[PDB]
From Swiss-Prot, chain C:
Protein name, UniProt field: V-type proton ATPase subunit d
Chain's role: Subunit of the V0 complex of vacuolar(H+)-ATPase (V-ATPase), a multisubunit enzyme composed of a peripheral complex (V1) that hydrolyzes ATP and a membrane integral complex (V0) that translocates protons. V-ATPase is responsible for acidifying and maintaining the pH of intracellular compartments. This subunit is a non-integral membrane component of the membrane pore domain and is required for proper assembly of the V0 sector. Might be involved in the regulated assembly of V1 subunits onto the membrane sector or alternatively may prevent the passage of protons through V0 pores.
Membrane topology annotation: Peripheral membrane protein
Keyword Membrane (UniProt): yes
Record family assignment: Belongs to the V-ATPase V0D/AC39 subunit family.
One of the protein's GO biological processes: proton transmembrane transport
One Gene Ontology MF term: proton-transporting ATPase activity, rotational mechanism
Glycoprotein as UniProt keyword: no
One Pfam family, short name: vATP-synt_AC39
A GO-annotated cellular component: vacuolar proton-transporting V-type ATPase complex
Assembly information from the UniProt record: V-ATPase is a heteromultimeric enzyme composed of a peripheral catalytic V1 complex (components A to H) attached to an integral membrane V0 proton pore complex (components: a, c, c', c'', d, e, f and VOA1).
Curated annotation (Swiss-Prot), chain E:
Provenance organism: Saccharomyces cerevisiae (strain ATCC 204508 / S288c)
Family: Belongs to the V-ATPase proteolipid subunit family.
Keyword entries, A-Z: Hydrogen ion transport, Ion transport, Membrane, Transmembrane, Transmembrane helix, Transport, Vacuole
Misc note: Present with 538 molecules/cell in log phase SD medium.
GO CC term (a single one): membrane
Membrane topology: Multi-pass membrane protein
Task performed by this protein: Proton-conducting pore forming subunit of the V0 complex of vacuolar(H+)-ATPase (V-ATPase), a multisubunit enzyme composed of a peripheral complex (V1) that hydrolyzes ATP and a membrane integral complex (V0) that translocates protons. V-ATPase is responsible for acidifying and maintaining the pH of intracellular compartments.
Single Gene Ontology MF annotation: proton-transporting ATPase activity, rotational mechanism
Bilayer-spanning residue ranges: 9-31, 54-74, 93-114, 127-152
Classification lineage: Eukaryota, Fungi, Dikarya, Ascomycota, Saccharomycotina
Residues on Vacuolar side: 75-92, 153-157
Self-association state and partner proteins as the record states: V-ATPase is a heteromultimeric enzyme composed of a peripheral catalytic V1 complex (components A to H) attached to an integral membrane V0 proton pore complex (components: a, c, c', c'', d, e, f and VOA1). The decameric c-ring forms the proton-conducting pore, and is composed of eight proteolipid subunits c, one subunit c' and one subunit c''.
Site description Essential for proton translocation, residues in chain: E139
UniProt xrefs under CDD domains: ATP-synt_Vo_c_ATP6C_rpt1, ATP-synt_Vo_c_ATP6C_rpt2
Protein name: V-type proton ATPase subunit c'
Curated annotation (Swiss-Prot), chain F:
Vacuolar side: 28-29, 91-138, 198-240, 300-320
Superkingdom: Eukaryota
Subunit structure: V-ATPase is a heteromultimeric enzyme composed of a peripheral catalytic V1 complex (components A to H) attached to an integral membrane V0 proton pore complex (components: a, c, c', c'', d, e, f and VOA1).
Entry protein name: V-type proton ATPase subunit a, vacuolar isoform
Outcome after substituting F364L: Reduces assembly of V-ATPase complexes
From Swiss-Prot, chain K:
Taxonomy, superkingdom: Eukaryota
Residues exposed to the Vacuolar side: 1-8
Residues of the whole record sequence present: 1 to 54 of 160
Ranges per topology, Cytoplasmic: 32-53
Name this protein carries in UniProt: V-type proton ATPase subunit c
Protein localization: Vacuole membrane
Upper classification of the organism: Eukaryota, Fungi, Dikarya, Ascomycota, Saccharomycotina
Subunit structure, as described in the record: V-ATPase is a heteromultimeric enzyme composed of a peripheral catalytic V1 complex (components A to H) attached to an integral membrane V0 proton pore complex (components: a, c, c', c'', d, e, f and VOA1). The decameric c-ring forms the proton-conducting pore, and is composed of eight proteolipid subunits c, one subunit c' and one subunit c''.
Gene name of the record: VMA3
Transmembrane feature ranges: 9-31
Length: 200, 51, 344, 159, 157, 384, 159, 159, 160, 159, 54
């Protein structure tokens, strides 16, 4: 774009492509692939570190949700403290849903053991290394996005209150709908994680 | 067994994932570069009917 | 949205919504209809949004000037605090809004030849928020042309100085009205430029077209003033007609080209928005009502810079109608009691 | 120098703690800066609460010790050559705790200064806006336990 | 083992599953986020039609549930100890991304549609039938990504 | 927080009783409860005169309860001692505990001999390497779950306790009953397994063992087995218990539409209520885990604090270590007063308050009355 | 393995159909949303007109059907061992029709709000209405037709 | 695996069969969106400039098919085995012609909108507006005049 | 030469030692720079605070002192022949203190700005703002002690 | 060719020599530009008191001579009979002093700007600003002193 | 051939020599231009000191 940052980011987009084509004309490009790297690392990449990320990122997702809510909370309260209790209710949804990631992180981090020197790349542990990220990133991202959606919707409700308290229940369904995915992703990910195995 | 070992000088895996850290740094810095200062409260009107 | 508008305007949005919902209710207007004397207004002037501090101004024969001034006082305090707690975008939005309410103030600085209006009276007629530390208006003459350089240096109005430099010391309401229309065009251009520059996606329209219609009303009013005897250069009219409105601009330049009742009619015949220029019933009050309806038609979006622009209009209109009913009682008329230009 | 017993333990063992303390510094600077400006702005209006709204200062300070505790743990555990098991995990824990602290920083910051501006005019919940405050702490509290679980796993049993 | 039978075909399947569910949840969350705005904005003056306005946001959940059902069905064919035919590993993520983008597109559609489609409807509440039958186009969009992905997965060994 | 209507069984009791004990067990310890009870002791001592003098911001609301501080503190000591954590410390004087292999060697996998008999709470056999907590947490998973499920079912009974107290059988009985069924016909199968490990000793039992939550997987995709057959005849009820436990919700809801067609006005609340309860059950179920979580978190906090405080001055020096010890205890005071009591209490009270609220009041105050709020003569003074 | 069907030949052979329907769905979303924002804009004027002015809303269903039918009937054009050239052509077919639907959506419905507003304003434009919609639609029929070509031709040069 | 008829020769033709259309579809969509969006305005203002205002969209539609024709015709000579020389030349022809047609679409879009906007105030103005419009769509002819010959050169030696 | 004592071990050593002072100095400079404006905003108007407002520059120069001390202490632990262990640790050790002090400055500049520009009206906030003024540098102190012991163990673990 | 004492090691030293002047230039230049712009706005109405603004630029001159003298020293140490350690220590010293000057110039420029703004009125306030100036410029002296021993102590006995 | 003495070494000098002149060219281009704009803006009514303003 007109800003140096975006132009810089668009600079190299084709440098790798041109080098690869030149090396394919030279011979090395034919020897370019990721399968070497797929089986070059260890599943400790794929298990040891693929755990805290989902927890932390769902945590910051609930963080953004609470950023959103807390404003509208006192925004509605200041004019009329007839809502304070009614204000401080759905926030707990965001507070709580964050721990779905901790659930799986803790329960499967228990399953962590030594990655066997033998069969580092077999159907025993590297498979489980894959599944570890997959599940963790999957659930964590789902949780972050549910958290942002619920926080924003809750703020929307918390600004639709000063008009009338009686309107609360009639519009109470939105967060009810939102929160289901927070458990849905959790269950699907935990299923896929349990069906597989650990470092073995 | 790597794309290019010249990129490797005893560290062929050490920093290959050291980028997401800086990505998080910059994404946070985006809002760090943002703030509020609300001078209007930091000074008081000369005439009360102003505010 | 989620990120399009949500940076620091969350509690700002909440307070703005509480403000907008806190507009005068039909029950207040009905009770005013019960009020047929000034005392009944004052006593009723405690359950309203503007009440509980607007009573006790005078024993009787209330001057609606002070009533509406102190009614708008709380609106001004609310708006200035809204400006106090804001990000950069809303900060410049407030700055633009307040820099248009000094154009009347500078017109006051300019119009009088030598009157030296009381400095207290300067802020009692125009908005004091755009006003700041004392400016020469009483210790010196308020002349028309010699002072323009003094305010130029004293007050930064370059975006609002758009060939407002001209001959003014001719004892000419011509000069005053043309400089006021130049300032109107200049500020309209500046504020519409900001609208098209930085603005949320859904409120793009509700501000751009609203500025367009306000510029249209400005053009209608100035051309109407020019109908009787102000036939001057059509380019000067364009210098008067806000060039940024650009709603039925064919019709606007139709006004500019033709200087006659026929000219204005044919202009307001190829507009496709509304034909005609004069309607009985304080036509500017009718345009106030139309503009307020336009602004309030976008209250269902809970994150936009449109809610405040309509809430200011609503609150100042409620002050207007408080004055309206106060004078309807004062004038001893019981037919305009139900007549007003409020919609909330 | 292998997938069994590499030689680059200090790399990770030190960068983890460095990043932790760095994120602590970042969050603390952000929160303290905003809170100071907001409170000094508000106090002049109603200096009755000259210190009665300092609580965000204390909560911001709370987090200032996690990067120290985990750092000393790894410092006791860190060496040059260890098991590849204890070769890389620490970074995940460190970044998790630091980013959690940062996000809590933004929460406390924005929500608390909204409370502060509400303060001088609506003491209706002066003692009772503190709920928005006391919420966020669990945010940072979350990652600590999960991080320390694997911190112990790496410090005690390399296996 | 065949090159078409490497040790990371289940890896591709897991990629497909993760992407499929995450994208669908993103679309759903965006839909809910956009939904609440107009609903909050309307109660101030019409707390009656609010009930009539239920359909879009609630109906959106089909995208989430079915972008998940695809992930379920592609699962149950991967063993903790077997690496399967490579083309199946690719087909997983292929149909998964298909559905993952179709669902977010539909979310964009209905989210920008309904939130604004009733703003002035308060003025003409009789327009319920029109304002609801308008969403018949948007709703059916996501269904066909799954209607294809089903037999798609039945096909391919 | 909220109020109820006429002839309603108000839930003041469980709020009074069960709340403070979660608060205490949340981080219950000797010193914590001891010191805060001492503070409450001074408070009630000066209650004679302190009341007249005004109160600090929090101390304002504090006067709403003074003995409650003791209520939480005593619970804290009791539960901490039950868990043998004296600032995260366990003493061996119980002398029941557990016995170890004779030639137990550091760095080896050592199991305390399966001969110990210390049914009283927790032993001292958890001070070794990581494994102790590593599985203590794994089992504590089910502690909060089971106790909270018991508490919530206890609360749930009061629903009909009031309904049929009003002799209400129009549709209320046909709503609680499907709810009661879809609740218990589901939780019971899990709960029987919760303590089944207590029942079945797998140390010497040559039968397949379960994962802590293994049974769930097959519950959904064509159940009928346990995948390790934890009990043969239980596989039959694994499928004989849900087929009817699920059809109750449609049985709950399809009562209206033939009343004179669909009522519409009823239908909206009815439809939302069905699914929202069907999910709120599991919401409240998953709730209670923080009692475990933050309790262990503060346990880690206390352990690390002890490590970085106590043994720092463990050296034996007389002329130089005087100020070292002085400063070490000074910072020990600075931490014990503030960090171990303030955040701990705030978090614990928050959790307990809302764990009561969004769980019990979620179904208690379905209908609410109005404040009678009597008025009469009173007294006042003069002050600006 | 051989360069006629390298390791990345099966990748494209299974991926090509993956890229088709997505862009059609994107375009349908954009166009029909911009259709609704104009529909509601003035349908209060003489309601009961929504099966006489229902063209732009419905029009994107068939554009979606493009990607749907190609991505489904690609089934016959799949193989565990197909040539690299086969994979390239399949990828081209699966991407080009989808991006063609995307280009269709770029404007096929954006102008609907501008246009349909005149039904209650200038109903004399029963001719002027369908003009731009037709000039938009005529563009769309160029992608699926060329897609069918390589779809049928994938049966050749396969190994 | 043949320096005069390799298996990367089909690489230049596979995506070539869609490159011309990727350029031309975008050009046509841009032209349509720009020169056919505010037309409702003039139609309502005066619904008698219509039939003359229809040419630019017609030119856009006509130019649309330029990219498709070359690709489809060369597809009669598309396979896995043929000269990399032919692949080079046909791919270059397709890219050049498609992007030139995209440029034509851009020019017609940016000129036709202005033409229709100006025409409102002058019935005669079509005489100049179309006068300059015809220059707008020539770039497609410019591209094809050599793209077709180079495509023939691609087919001048078949496999 | 083994990576227990390679050629490019001090590669990280010297460079990190140079960098350590850098970011803390940058923060101090940025803070003092954008503080002077707030300082002057009223000095002519209310010069009755002429000696009082001197705090922020000191609060900035303290982290400069911090960078100085860390760099000086690490200076005598560098050489051509040293273990790559040292470079591994210093890959984060120096930047820790550097940009921690940087962030500290970034905060203190703004707090001092707000405090001074609010002070001219009510001198009764002197304690108020100076409280946070002295509160801030705890971050520096944290960095100092952490880097101290970190590098202590690092140089105690040099293979040599 | 060995990696111990590579012949292309001294390139780091050469670029360090370069920066030793590049960065001090950039800084002093920008700062003195601010100096000039401010002194114009000031001297205009008080053009007889400029004597109280002569040194503010000699400060930047002294800043420059820092780079000058460090360049003077580095000349001998730069060589191809060098050790990579030597080249990198030279690089570090040069870049460190350069960035220190970068910070210092910005700081001194802003503070001098503020002080000149104030000085137009106060006759006694010049003391009120040099306070800021001295403790702003010290940071450069920190950098200089650290670099002196960083290089000099290490630039010898390096082999 | 050798890294110490390769064929491409003079490339670096041949580019660096141009680097300085291009850099100074751009710097002067910005600077004298920004000077002259204000210079002429002032000289509009100041043909009295222009020769003193160069």
């Amino acid at each position: 774009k007109f800003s140096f940052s975006h132009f810089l980011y668009y600079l190299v987009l084709i440098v790798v492509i041109v080098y690869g084509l030149y090396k394919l004309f030279t011979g090395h490009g034919s020897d370019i692939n990721f399968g070497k790297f797929l089986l070059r690392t260890s599943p400790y990449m794929w298990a040891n570190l693929g755990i805290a990320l989902c927890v932390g990122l769902s945590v910051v997702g609930a963080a953004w949700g609470i950023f959103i809510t807390g404003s509208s909370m006192i925004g509605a309260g200041v004019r009329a403290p007839r809502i304070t209790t009614k204000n401080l209710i759905s926030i707990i949804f965001c507070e709580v849903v964050a721990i779905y990631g901790l659930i799986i992180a803790i329960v499967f981090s228990s399953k962590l053991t030594v990655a066997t020197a033998e069969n580092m790349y077999s159907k025993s542990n590297l498979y489980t290394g894959y599944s570890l990220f997959w599940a963790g990133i999957t659930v964590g991202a789902s949780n972050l996005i549910c958290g942002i959606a619920v926080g924003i919707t809750g703020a929307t409700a918390a600004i639709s209150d000063a008009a009338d308290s009686a309107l609360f229940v009639k519009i109470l369904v939105i967060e009810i709908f939102g929160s289901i995915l927070g458990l849905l992703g959790l269950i699907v990910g935990l299923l896929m994680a349990g069906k597989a195995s650990e470092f073995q | 067994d790597i794309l290019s070992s010249i990129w490797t000088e005893g560290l062929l895996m050490c920093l290959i994932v050291s980028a997401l850290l800086l990505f998080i740094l910059i994404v946070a810095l985006s809002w760090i570069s943002n703030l509020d200062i609300t001078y209007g409260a930091l000074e008081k009107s000369t005439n009360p009917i102003k505010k | 949205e989620g990120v399009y508008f949500n940076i620091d305007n969350g509690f700002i949005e909440g307070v703005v919504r509480g403000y907008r919902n806190g507009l005068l209710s039909n029950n207040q207007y009905i009770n005013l209809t019960q009020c047929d004397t000034l005392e009944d207004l004052k006593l009723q002037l405690s359950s309203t949004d503007y009440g509980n501090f607007l009573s006790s101004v005078s024993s009787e024969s209330l001057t609606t000037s002070l009533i509406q001034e102190y009614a708008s006082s709380k609106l001004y305090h609310e708006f200035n605090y809204i400006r106090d707690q804001s990000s950069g975008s809303t900060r410049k939005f407030m700055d633009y809004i307040t820099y248009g309410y000094m154009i009347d103030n500078v017109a006051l600085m300019i119009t009088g030849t030598i009157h030296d209006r009381d400095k207290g009276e300067i802020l009692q007629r125009c908005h004091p928020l755009g006003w700041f530390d004392t400016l020469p208006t009483l210790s010196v003459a308020t002349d028309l042309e010699s002072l323009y350089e003094t305010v130029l240096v004293d007050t930064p109005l370059a975006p609002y100085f758009k060939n407002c430099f001209d001959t003014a010391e001719e004892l000419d309401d011509m000069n005053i009205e043309i400089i006021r229309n130049k300032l109107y065009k200049a500020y309209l251009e500046d504020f519409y430029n900001f609208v098209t520059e930085e603005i949320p996606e859904p409120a793009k329209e509700c501000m751009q077209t609203l500025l367009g219609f306000e510029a249209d009303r400005r053009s209608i009013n100035i051309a109407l003033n020019s109908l009787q005897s102000s036939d001057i250069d059509p380019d000067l009219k364009s210098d008067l007609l806000p060039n940024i409105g650009k709603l039925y601009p064919l019709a606007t330049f139709h006004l500019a080209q033709a200087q006659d009742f026929e000219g204005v009619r044919a202009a307001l015949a190829n507009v496709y928005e509304y034909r005609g220029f004069l309607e009985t019933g304080n036509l500017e009050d009718h345009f106030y009502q139309l503009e307020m309806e336009l602004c309030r038609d976008a209250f269902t979006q809970q994150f936009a810079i449109s809610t405040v622009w309509a809430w200011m209009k609503s609150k100042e209109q409620e002050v207007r109608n408080i004055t309206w009913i106060a004078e309807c009682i004062a004038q001893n008329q019981r037919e305009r009691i139900n007549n007003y230009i409020s919609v909330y | 120098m292998t997938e069994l017993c590499p030689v680059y333990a200090p790399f990770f063992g030190a960068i983890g703690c460095a990043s932790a303390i760095i994120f602590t510094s970042l969050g603390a600077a952000y929160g303290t800066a905003k809170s100071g400006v907001g409170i000094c702005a508000t106090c002049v209006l109603r200096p009755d609460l000259l210190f009665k709204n300092i609580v965000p200062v204390i909560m911001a300070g709370i987090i200032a010790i996690y990067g120290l505790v985990v750092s000393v743990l790894v410092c006791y555990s860190l060496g040059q050559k260890q098991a590849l098991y204890t070769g890389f995990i620490q970074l995940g824990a460190g970044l998790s705790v630091g980013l959690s602290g940062l996000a809590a920083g933004f929460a406390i910051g924005i929500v608390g200064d909204a409370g502060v501006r509400g303060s001088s005019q609506q003491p209706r919940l002066f003692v009772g806006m503190i709920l928005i405050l006391i919420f966020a702490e669990v945010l940072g509290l979350y990652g600590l336990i999960v991080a320390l679980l694997l911190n112990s796993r790496a410090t005690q049993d390399v296996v | 083992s065949n090159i078409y039978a490497p040790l990371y075909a289940p890896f591709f399947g897991f990629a497909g599953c993760a992407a499929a569910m995450v994208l669908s949840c993103l679309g759903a969350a965006i839909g809910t986020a956009k939904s609440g705005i107009g609903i909050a904005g309307i109660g101030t003056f019409k707390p009656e039609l609010i009930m009539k306005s239920l359909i879009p946001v609630v109906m959106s959940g089909i995208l989430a549930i079915y972008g998940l059902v695809v992930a379920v069905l592609i699962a149950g064919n991967l063993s903790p100890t077997e690496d399967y035919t490579l083309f199946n590993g690719f087909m997983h993520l292929s149909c998964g991304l298909c559905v993952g983008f179709a669902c977010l597109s539909s979310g964009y559609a209905i989210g920008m549609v309904g939130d604004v489609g009733v703003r002035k409807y308060m003025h003409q509440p009789r327009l319920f039938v029109g304002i609801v039958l308008i969403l018949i186009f948007s709703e059916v969009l996501g269904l066909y990504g799954m209607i294809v992905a089903l037999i798609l997965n039945t096909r391919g060994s | 927080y909220g109020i109820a209507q006429y002839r309603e069984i108000n839930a003041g009791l469980p709020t009074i009783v069960t709340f403070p004990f979660m608060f205490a067990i949340m981080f219950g310890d000797m010193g914590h409860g001891f010191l805060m009870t001492l503070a409450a002791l001074s408070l009630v001592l000066n209650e004679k005169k302190i009341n007249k003098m005004k109160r600090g911001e929090i101390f304002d609301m504090a006067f709403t309860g003074r003995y409650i501080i003791l209520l939480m503190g005593v619970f804290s000591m009791y539960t901490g001692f039950l868990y043998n954590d004296i600032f995260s410390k366990t003493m061996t004087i119980f002398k029941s505990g557990w016995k170890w292999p004779d030639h137990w060697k550091k760095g080896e996998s050592i199991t305390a001999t399966s001969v110990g008999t210390y049914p009283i709470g927790l032993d001292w056999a958890w001070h070794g390497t990581e494994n102790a907590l590593l599985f203590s947490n794994s089992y504590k998973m089910k502690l909060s779950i089971l106790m909270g499920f018991i508490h919530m079912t206890y609360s749930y009974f009061f629903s009909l306790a009031n309904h049929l107290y009003f002799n209400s059988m129009i549709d209320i009985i046909g709503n609680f009953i499907p709810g009661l069924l879809f609740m218990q016909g589901i939780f019971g199968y899990l709960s029987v397994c919760i303590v089944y490990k207590w029942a079945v000793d797998w140390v010497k039992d040559g039968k397949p063992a379960p994962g802590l939550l293994n049974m769930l997987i097959n519950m959904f995709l064509s159940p009928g087995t346990i995948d390790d057959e934890l009990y043969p005849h239980q596989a039959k009820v694994q499928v004989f218990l849900l087929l009817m436990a699920l059809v109750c919700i449609p049985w709950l809801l399809l009562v209206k539409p033939l009343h004179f067609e669909d009522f519409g006005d009823i239908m909206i609340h009815q439809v939302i209520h069905t699914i929202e309860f069907c999910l709120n059950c599991v919401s409240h179920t998953a709730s209670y885990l923080r009692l475990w979580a933050l309790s262990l978190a503060h346990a880690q906090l206390s352990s690390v604090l002890w490590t970085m405080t106590i043994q720092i001055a463990f050296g034996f020096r007389g002329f130089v270590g005087v100020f070292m010890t002085v400063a070490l205890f000074a910072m020990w005071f600075a931490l014990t007063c503030a960090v171990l009591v303030l955040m701990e209490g705030t978090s614990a009270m928050l959790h307990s308050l809302r764990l009561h609220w969004v769980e019990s009041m979620s179904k208690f105050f379905v209908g609410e009355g109005l404040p009678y709020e009597p008025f009469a003569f009173e007294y006042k003074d003069m002050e600006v």
